[PDB]
């Protein structure tokens, strides 16, 4: 099977400038090599086919480029439309196959995250398990570190995070950690800690709260 | 306008079956040739299958013959993907597409895209908790809340918050699979801690797969 390689995962970008996303194969597909965009929740538009052809509709700042294993996207001044994430197709051979895309996010000023620390609910511990969440809102860049200390201790493996899509209009990322534990550890510890790192920060911040109060 | 209608899918249990449909109008559909994609949780898209405007061409990838059969009705300007044998792997979100065949098997046009899980586990509505508002709340600052959604089974819930009259600064974040095999997510949103104490706050839970639906209250705790 021929491999589509897409060397970033993630570029960042300004409104107006050029961005050009590669594509490569892992053997010639001469030039038969279509690019798609799509959006969160949205399926994919057709944009490149025949690598550096139009579809009909497609704005004339979308162009494509390469032949035999090699192979570009350019985006001419980029509108804020275009926020999305591309990716290339193959048509030489079967099976087809698809490159698994690149996102692009808009810059802007570094924001540090607000920082929120949730206890379970009284409702929760009847059921035997305690969640316990902490929130960092409206930040960026996307790269964050949330640990979480329970009475000062580094855990490890019982947490999991979530993180938001840029939002269109501040363009900052939020994101959610949970911590889970049964309700019988939960009673047996008194600090519950969520620490953060983040570009923003000169140091890290910590929300905590004492069980029970 | 051209547009691909799918339907179908859901949750079905391993070495089950299940018929996926892609109607397609605003095209001559039997002029054309058409294609099943699907991508995965996490995963890139994968090319599952093709067939010509009169059915005497199918091809599969080689991966996938085994389990998939893709058919069209050209009257009911409709194709197929029937799904047998299925496996957990096959957990993923199916698109149809028609192909650009004046020059090659690009997609031109894209369905909505159907979702199917394949599991061993019954549906399972969520329970919802509050994530009440900070006691320390900054004083004439910004308090955040929230409700947690939790142990849901298949995907998706929506949440809202007033009855959708609550928009602003809410963040609902993508659910996660927790090892149990069951979903979480929360909805949080950030509001003026003036606010605490005139007005109320409740998140609207729906989990239609099991017709759960949750109005939770999300207050300062005593």
Same mark, same amino acid.
């Given at each position: 099977?021929?491999v589509?390689?897409?060397?970033?995962?993630?570029?960042?970008?300004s @409104?107006?400038?050029? @961005?050009?996303? !590669?594509?490569?194969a892992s053997?010639s597909?001469?030039?038969?090599?279509?690019?798609?965009?799509?959006?969160?929740?949205?399926?994919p538009?057709?944009?490149?086919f025949?690598?550096?052809?139009?579809?009909?509709?497609?704005?004339?700042?979308?162009?494509?480029?390469?032949?035999?294993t090699?192979?570009?996207?350019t985006?001419?001044?980029?509108?804020?439309?275009?926020?999305?994430?591309?990716?290339?197709?193959?048509?030489?051979n079967?099976?087809? !196959?698809?490159?698994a895309?690149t996102?692009?996010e808009?810059?802007?000023?570094?924001?540090?995250?607000?920082?929120?620390?949730?206890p379970?609910?009284?409702?929760?511990?009847?059921?035997?398990?305690?969640?316990?969440?902490?929130?960092?809102?409206?930040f960026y860049?996307?790269?964050?570190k949330?640990?979480?200390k329970?009475?000062?201790?580094?855990?490890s493996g019982?947490?999991?995070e979530?993180?938001?899509?840029?939002?269109?209009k501040?363009? !900052?990322?939020?994101?959610?950690?949970?911590?889970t534990?049964?309700?019988?550890?939960?009673?047996?510890?008194? @600090?519950?800690?969520?620490? @953060?790192?983040?570009?923003?920060?000169?140091?890290?911040?910590?929300?905590?709260?004492?069980?029970?109060? | 306008?051209?547009?691909?209608?799918?339907? #179908?899918?859901?949750?079905?249990?391993?070495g089950?079956?299940?018929?996926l449909?892609?109607?397609?109008?605003? $095209?001559?559909?039997?002029?054309?040739?058409?294609?099943?994609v699907?991508?995965?949780?996490?995963?890139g898209?994968?090319? $599952? #299958?093709?067939?010509?405007?009169?059915?005497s061409? $199918?091809? *599969?990838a080689?991966s996938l013959?085994?389990?998939?059969?893709?058919?069209?009705?050209?009257?009911?300007?409709?194709?197929?993907?029937?799904?047998?044998?299925?496996?957990?792997?096959?957990?993923?979100? *199916?698109?149809?597409?028609?192909?650009? +065949?004046? +020059?090659?098997?690009?997609?031109?046009?894209?369905?909505?895209?159907?979702?199917?899980?394949?599991?061993?586990?019954?549906?399972?509505?969520?329970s919802?908790?509050?994530?009440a508002?900070?006691?320390?709340?900054?004083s004439?600052?910004?308090?955040?809340?929230?409700?947690?959604?939790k142990? +849901?089974?298949?995907?998706?819930?929506?949440?809202?918050?007033?009855?959708?009259?609550?928009?602003?600064?809410?963040?609902?974040?993508?659910?996660?699979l927790?090892?149990?095999?069951?979903y979480?997510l929360?909805?949080?949103?950030?509001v003026?801690?003036?606010?605490?104490?005139?007005?109320?706050?409740?998140?609207?839970?729906?989990?239609?797969?099991?017709?759960?639906?949750?109005?939770?209250?999300?207050?300062?705790?005593?």
């Amino acid at each position: 099977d021929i491999v589509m390689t897409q060397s970033q995962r993630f570029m960042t970008t300004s @409104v107006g400038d050029r @961005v050009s996303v !590669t594509c490569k194969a892992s053997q010639s597909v001469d030039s038969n090599v279509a690019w798609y965009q799509q959006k969160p929740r949205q399926s994919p538009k057709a944009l490149i086919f025949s690598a550096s052809l139009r579809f009909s509709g497609v704005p004339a700042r979308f162009t494509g480029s390469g032949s035999g294993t090699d192979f570009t996207l350019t985006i001419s001044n980029l509108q804020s439309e275009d926020l999305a994430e591309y990716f290339c197709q193959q048509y030489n051979n079967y099976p087809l !196959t698809f490159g698994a895309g690149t996102k692009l996010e808009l810059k802007r000023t570094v924001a540090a995250p607000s920082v929120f620390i949730f206890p379970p609910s009284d409702e929760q511990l009847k059921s035997g398990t305690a969640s316990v969440v902490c929130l960092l809102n409206n930040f960026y860049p996307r790269e964050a570190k949330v640990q979480w200390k329970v009475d000062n201790a580094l855990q490890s493996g019982n947490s999991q995070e979530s993180v938001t899509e840029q939002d269109s209009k501040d363009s !900052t990322y939020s994101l959610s950690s949970t911590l889970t534990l049964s309700k019988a550890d939960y009673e047996k510890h008194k @600090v519950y800690a969520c620490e @953060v790192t983040h570009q923003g920060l000169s140091s890290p911040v910590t929300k905590s709260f004492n069980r029970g109060e | 306008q051209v547009q691909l209608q799918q339907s #179908g899918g859901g949750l079905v249990q391993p070495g089950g079956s299940l018929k996926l449909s892609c109607a397609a109008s605003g $095209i001559d559909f039997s002029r054309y040739w058409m294609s099943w994609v699907r991508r995965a949780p996490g995963k890139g898209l994968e090319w $599952i #299958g093709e067939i010509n405007p009169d059915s005497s061409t $199918i091809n *599969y990838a080689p991966s996938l013959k085994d389990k998939f059969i893709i058919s069209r009705d050209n009257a009911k300007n409709t194709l197929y993907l029937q799904m047998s044998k299925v496996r957990s792997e096959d957990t993923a979100l *199916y698109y149809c597409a028609s192909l650009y +065949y004046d +020059y090659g098997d690009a997609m031109d046009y894209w369905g909505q895209g159907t979702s199917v899980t394949v599991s061993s586990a019954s549906t399972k509505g969520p329970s919802v908790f509050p994530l009440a508002p900070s006691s320390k709340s900054t004083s004439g600052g910004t308090a955040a809340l929230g409700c947690l959604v939790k142990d +849901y089974f298949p995907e998706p819930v929506t949440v809202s918050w007033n009855s959708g009259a609550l928009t602003s600064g809410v963040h609902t974040f993508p659910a996660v699979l927790q090892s149990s095999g069951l979903y979480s997510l929360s909805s949080v949103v950030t509001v003026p801690s003036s606010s605490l104490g005139t007005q109320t706050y409740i998140c609207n839970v729906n989990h239609k797969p099991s017709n759960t639906k949750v109005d939770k209250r999300v207050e300062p705790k005593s």
